[PDB]
Amino acid sequence: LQEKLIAVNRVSKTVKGGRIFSFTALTVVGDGNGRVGFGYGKAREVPAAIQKAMEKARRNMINVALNNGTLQHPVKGVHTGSRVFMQPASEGTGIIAGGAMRAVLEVAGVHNVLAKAYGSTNPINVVRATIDGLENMNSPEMVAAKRGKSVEEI
Amino acid sequence: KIRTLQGRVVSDKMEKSIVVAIERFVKHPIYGKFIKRTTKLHVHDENNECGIGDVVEIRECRPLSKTKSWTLVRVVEKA
Amino acid sequence: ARYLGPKLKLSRREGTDLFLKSGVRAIDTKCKIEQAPGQHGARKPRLSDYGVQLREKQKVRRIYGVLERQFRNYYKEAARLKGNTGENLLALLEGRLDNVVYRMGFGATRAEARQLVSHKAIMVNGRVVNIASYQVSPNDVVSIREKAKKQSRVKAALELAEQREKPTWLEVDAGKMEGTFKRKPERSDLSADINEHLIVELYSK
Amino acid sequence: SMQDPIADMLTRIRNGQAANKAAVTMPSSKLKVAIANVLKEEGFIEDFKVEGDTKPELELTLKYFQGKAVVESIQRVSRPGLRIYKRKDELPKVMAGLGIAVVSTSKGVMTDRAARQAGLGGEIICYVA
Amino acid sequence: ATVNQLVRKPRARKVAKSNVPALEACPQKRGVCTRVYTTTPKKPNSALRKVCRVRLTNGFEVTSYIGGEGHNLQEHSVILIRGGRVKDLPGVRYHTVRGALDCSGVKDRKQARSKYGVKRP
RNA sequence: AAAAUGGCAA
RNA sequence: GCUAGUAGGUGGGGUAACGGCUCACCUAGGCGACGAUCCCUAGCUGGUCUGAGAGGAUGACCAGCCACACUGGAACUGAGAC
RNA sequence: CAGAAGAAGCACCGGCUAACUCCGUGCCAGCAGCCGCGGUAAUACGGAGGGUGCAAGCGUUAAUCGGAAUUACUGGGCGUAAAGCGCACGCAGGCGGUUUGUUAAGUCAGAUGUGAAAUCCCCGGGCUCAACCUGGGAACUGCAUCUGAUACUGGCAAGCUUGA
RNA sequence: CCUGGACGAAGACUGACGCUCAGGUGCGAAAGCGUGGGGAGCAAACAGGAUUAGAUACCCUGGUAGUCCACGCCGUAAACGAUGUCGACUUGGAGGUUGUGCGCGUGGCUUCCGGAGCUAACGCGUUAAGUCGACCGCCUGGGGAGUACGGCCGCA
RNA sequence: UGAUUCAUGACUGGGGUGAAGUCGUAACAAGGUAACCGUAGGGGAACCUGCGGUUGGAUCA
Numbered sequence A: 001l002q003e004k005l006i007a008v009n010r011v012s013k014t015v016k017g018g019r020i021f022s023f024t025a026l027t028v029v030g031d032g033n034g035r036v037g038f039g040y041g042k043a044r045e046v047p048a049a050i051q052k053a054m055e056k057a058r059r060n061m062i063n064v065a066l067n068n069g070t071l072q073h074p075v076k077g078v079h080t081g082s083r084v085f086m087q088p089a090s091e092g093t094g095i096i097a098g099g100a101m102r103a104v105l106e107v108a109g110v111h112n113v114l115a116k117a118y119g120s121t122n123p124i125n126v127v128r129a130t131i132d133g134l135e136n137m138n139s140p141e142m143v144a145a146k147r148g149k150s151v152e153e154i
Numbered sequence B: 001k002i003r004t005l006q007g008r009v010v011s012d013k014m015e016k017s018i019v020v021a022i023e024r025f026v027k028h029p030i031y032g033k034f035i036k037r038t039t040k041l042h043v044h045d046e047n048n049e050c051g052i053g054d055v056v057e058i059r060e061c062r063p064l065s066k067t068k069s070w071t072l073v074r075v076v077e078k079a
Numbered sequence C: 001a002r003y004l005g006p007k008l009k010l011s012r013r014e015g016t017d018l019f020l021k022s023g024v025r026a027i028d029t030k031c032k033i034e035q036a037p038g039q040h041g042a043r044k045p046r047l048s049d050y051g052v053q054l055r056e057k058q059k060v061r062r063i064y065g066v067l068e069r070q071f072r073n074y075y076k077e078a079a080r081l082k083g084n085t086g087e088n089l090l091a092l093l094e095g096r097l098d099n100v101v102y103r104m105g106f107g108a109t110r111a112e113a114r115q116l117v118s119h120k121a122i123m124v125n126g127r128v129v130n131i132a133s134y135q136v137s138p139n140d141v142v143s144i145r146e147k148a149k150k151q152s153r154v155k156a157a158l159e160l161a162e163q164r165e166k167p168t169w170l171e172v173d174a175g176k177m178e179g180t181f182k183r184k185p186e187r188s189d190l191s192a193d194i195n196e197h198l199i200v201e202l203y204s205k
Numbered sequence D: 001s002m003q004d005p006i007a008d009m010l011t012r013i014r015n016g017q018a019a020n021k022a023a024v025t026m027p028s029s030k031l032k033v034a035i036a037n038v039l040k041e042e043g044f045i046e047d048f049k050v051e052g053d054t055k056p057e058l059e060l061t062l063k064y065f066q067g068k069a070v071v072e073s074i075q076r077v078s079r080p081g082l083r084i085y086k087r088k089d090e091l092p093k094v095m096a097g098l099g100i101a102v103v104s105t106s107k108g109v110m111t112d113r114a115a116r117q118a119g120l121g122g123e124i125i126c127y128v129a
Numbered sequence E: 001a002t003v004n005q006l007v008r009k010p011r012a013r014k015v016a017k018s019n020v021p022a023l024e025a026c027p028q029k030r031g032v033c034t035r036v037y038t039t040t041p042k043k044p045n046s047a048l049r050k051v052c053r054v055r056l057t058n059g060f061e062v063t064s065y066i067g068g069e070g071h072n073l074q075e076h077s078v079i080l081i082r083g084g085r086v087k088d089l090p091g092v093r094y095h096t097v098r099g100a101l102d103c104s105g106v107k108d109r110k111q112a113r114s115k116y117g118v119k120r121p
Numbered sequence F: 001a002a003a004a005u006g007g008c009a010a
Numbered sequence G: 001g002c003u004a005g006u007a008g009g010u011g012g013g014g015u016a017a018c019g020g021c022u023c024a025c026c027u028a029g030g031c032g033a034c035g036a037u038c039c040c041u042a043g044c045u046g047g048u049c050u051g052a053g054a055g056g057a058u059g060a061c062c063a064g065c066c067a068c069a070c071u072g073g074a075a076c077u078g079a080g081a082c
Numbered sequence H: 001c002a003g004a005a006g007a008a009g010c011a012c013c014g015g016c017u018a019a020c021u022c023c024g025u026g027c028c029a030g031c032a033g034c035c036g037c038g039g040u041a042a043u044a045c046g047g048a049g050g051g052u053g054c055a056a057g058c059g060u061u062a063a064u065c066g067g068a069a070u071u072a073c074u075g076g077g078c079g080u081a082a083a084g085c086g087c088a089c090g091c092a093g094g095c096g097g098u099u100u101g102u103u104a105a106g107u108c109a110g111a112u113g114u115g116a117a118a119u120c121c122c123c124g125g126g127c128u129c130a131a132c133c134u135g136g137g138a139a140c141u142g143c144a145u146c147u148g149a150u151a152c153u154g155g156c157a158a159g160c161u162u163g164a
Numbered sequence I: 001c002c003u004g005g006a007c008g009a010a011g012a013c014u015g016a017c018g019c020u021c022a023g024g025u026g027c028g029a030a031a032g033c034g035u036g037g038g039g040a041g042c043a044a045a046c047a048g049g050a051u052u053a054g055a056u057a058c059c060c061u062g063g064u065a066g067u068c069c070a071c072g073c074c075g076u077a078a079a080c081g082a083u084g085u086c087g088a089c090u091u092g093g094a095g096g097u098u099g100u101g102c103g104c105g106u107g108g109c110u111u112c113c114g115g116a117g118c119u120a121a122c123g124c125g126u127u128a129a130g131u132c133g134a135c136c137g138c139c140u141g142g143g144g145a146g147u148a149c150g151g152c153c154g155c156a
Numbered sequence J: 001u002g003a004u005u006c007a008u009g010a011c012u013g014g015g016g017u018g019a020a021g022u023c024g025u026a027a028c029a030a031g032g033u034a035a036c037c038g039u040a041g042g043g044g045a046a047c048c049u050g051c052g053g054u055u056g057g058a059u060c061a
């Protein structure tokens, strides 16, 4: 499983004594063959936060129906303020995507894609929008089964 | 054939002349909605046959006046 | 229009041997290949995504000795050419007369091959070509000039080439000191160490 | 007032699928029946039937593959407020060909693929996926 | 907005006014120093920043920052100005080009010499 | 019942 | 809101040629919220730059068209020029 | 023919953004695109060593588009962030239930004419390569006409009853 | 006394006669303005008494315009559901109010709660802020400013 | 003789910026008289008061 640290942020809560600082870590893990999950971890120390995120990511993996390292069709994903568009690309195109989307796509095993993030580019919401787009992608085989047709007919 | 336009007479006040409104349905270049556009032509009416609200066929001709280069072919519909 | 500085620093920055020396001796003996150049070289800073992309592009450039403007033009050509842009790009760099002369073993290094080409010691299809960037077509014959055949450097380079792995797409005859570019190298023929996708992504940044 | 009966039909399917209704019914029309035939032919709906003469009602039987609606998206394209027509060369592809575009051509209502085979353009009624 | 509304009134683009109007879309302009003085920056900065009031060839009168350490500018000095506001000096939208016309290069500069009109040692 | 005020800093 | 040669008609003159082009007489028209009139700015195009595209910006060089030739005005000669 | 001879600079190194330390200075002098930096241990000023990026150039300024889905046709919004007219009637305008026939305006298909050449793009050819030059094609998304198609939209005619 | 609208029942009738609406027109709280009345209570202003450091206030005692009527003007309000109008569609529960058929139905309007869905969140949730269609109005960083200037309107 | 545009003009209106100035304390908590909207009158100033309106008011033991 490939693991990528997307973002580390210092957050704060106020108490009578003063401010209490903690760290958050957004991570993604993937098998490079259409399995990908994201993890969000919080702790007083950065390494602890990363470890918690990685552990969550490993148990939150979902399956994506990739076609030869590319998407099946153009997909739109939305979470909170983040709206993402992703489209299949030719071999050698590479990952043409923004940073947060890039990590998800790389670990998922997408080698070629054209993407654009609209609205908020907040990493936590972008990761969720991206994974949402991928999960709702339809293979030709699944469309054929739902429509009661053969893939050739589709 | 001969190229002709069909339009509604909007004025017949001039002597031997009428103003005819030609309607064209055109797709808007950006928005893509089909919009009605109007072109008004001064037309020669030798017999002063046409009346306001009539539907007429007109053909292009040589200049007959400053603003007239079209002539009446027939009155398709009376008002 | 050419890098004339120390060669091993480039390899040290990349962290891999760029074959900027003959290979008569190991790079480790010549320099501390592992350590990056300079005072703070021993420290290994975390590299950003941009950093990773930049370093890959610089590595490929340093291997073939191409400056940015020419390398950018290669990228643009590779993108225009049909098929895989990254594969097209590597094919263009391989097609350079300079590279072909080194791969045929006429030159010990690409820089040595460059001087040979520049100094009119190389003929393509029986015509003298002194342009390093010249693109060699399939079935072209690259040969040393009769005058330059006697040079000691060329003979030494041929011996070194025997030690190195032989390119499948090139047929070379020693003594005759002529070679034929049979076909454009496949991606499989080239090293898998290079990640061309990073370069393509970088130029789309 | 009611100014787009086709959009109403598409919405009834969309809402019915969302509400996991077994079937949806509406006032019938020749155009609606034509669209229903394409939907049935492409396997988006199980069946359709028309009942009554003075006021015919079209009933469409919806389908769910695994407790999930087969029609994941259905959207009006050409609409009264903005009509969309395309040449055969510019005929739209839905979900990279996995979906269908319903097209009204001079030879009748058909999928984009069928229209492209017949080398005909027409009005893009709706996208279905 | 509906298509019908856009047909009646199309989307309108912004004015996009220049921040360097005195240049009048020229890379530089020549001017004569009417006054050379120092001004304090706005908070949270403290300094005595060197500026000149300049009357340009186009007739506009503007304030221009004199960058680098030390200068020879006086009233009646002919200088070349370029675009570039000074964040902490309100109303200063231009920089004096060091080492052009009457303005001399900064003395004893070894780095970023081209930015201060200093010839190679 | 009355019950005003407290430079910007980091 | 704009317009009295103004808009149209009849006849005469004029032009290489149709024509308010000009003139006499007659009618009262004509234009305009699908922006007339007025104000400001501007040579137009093939193209060029940018952009995934749709757009946006631009019209130097090259080629097509137009306009101008100290400023205002005028004709003459000529197949053709004001 | 003779000889390494005659031929390297510019910006940058706090984050964005590839590249770090020492010394000097001490809210000064100065830097600065933005966020900001400087009040005695400054990777942010100035110099030096080292490094990064470019290279016969390199920076700066001006200017256009991009990123900006930040005028949103493609492709945005309006309970509280900017945004529903105080409410309503209503002309122009936009849009409109269902059936048949007819028309063929829109629409669609094909053909013809035109859409200068250059340019752009593709496949080639020529200058040692390239830039550059050049052959043929494609394209010029348009406009007009002719001949067809008739589902949808429009027109016309006759209806229908579900809206009114 | 004159008069507008809504809703229900069962039939009959007309036969798309519809929806929206720039400009236009009408209506439009309170205060205010004009003319003529009226004037108990209340009460801007005003006066005095307190309170207070001061007290042009809050509190007290008084008190004029005004509040009322006729007619004309003004045309604005957090004129708010801060939610444009019309139509279709999409799980429920408890109420209120008003019809109607045979305890069980079936209509109109309305209050609370909540499901999916939606939403930045708060929340909305068949009376949508859900899912769609038609048409209109409006927005484009904060100040400067709903101000200046010009126009139109108004007695002001 | 008009229109329009630009420049300028004693003085004057409001706006902005700048010292740790002077006078108060109007708002934010029930901000110590809930706030705010329209309007009217008054007052060194923030504001106060009347009339109607809104909740984008706290409290309820």
Ligand SMILES: [K+]
Pocket (backbone or CB within 6 Å): E044, E045, E046, H027
């Ligand atoms: K400071």
Ligand SMILES: [K+]
Pocket (backbone or CB within 6 Å): G005, G020
């Ligand atoms: K005339």
Ligand SMILES: [K+]
Pocket (backbone or CB within 6 Å): none
């Ligand atoms: K005449």
Ligand SMILES: [K+]
Pocket (backbone or CB within 6 Å): none
């Ligand atoms: K253009």
Ligand SMILES: [K+]
Pocket (backbone or CB within 6 Å): none
């Ligand atoms: K002239």
Ligand SMILES: [K+]
Pocket (backbone or CB within 6 Å): G078
């Ligand atoms: K002649």
Ligand SMILES: [K+]
Pocket (backbone or CB within 6 Å): E001, H072, H075
């Ligand atoms: K839009």
Ligand SMILES: [K+]
Pocket (backbone or CB within 6 Å): none
């Ligand atoms: K028809």
Ligand SMILES: [K+]
Pocket (backbone or CB within 6 Å): H091, I021
């Ligand atoms: K109307």
Ligand SMILES: [K+]
Pocket (backbone or CB within 6 Å): I064
């Ligand atoms: K009284």
Ligand SMILES: [K+]
Pocket (backbone or CB within 6 Å): I084, I136, I137
């Ligand atoms: K409206």
Ligand SMILES: [K+]
Pocket (backbone or CB within 6 Å): none
């Ligand atoms: K004046």
Ligand SMILES: [K+]
Pocket (backbone or CB within 6 Å): none
């Ligand atoms: K108060």
Ligand SMILES: [K+]
Pocket (backbone or CB within 6 Å): none
């Ligand atoms: K008040």
Ligand SMILES: [Mg+2]
Pocket (backbone or CB within 6 Å): C001
């Ligand atoms: Mg060069």
Ligand SMILES: [Mg+2]
Pocket (backbone or CB within 6 Å): none
């Ligand atoms: Mg000009």
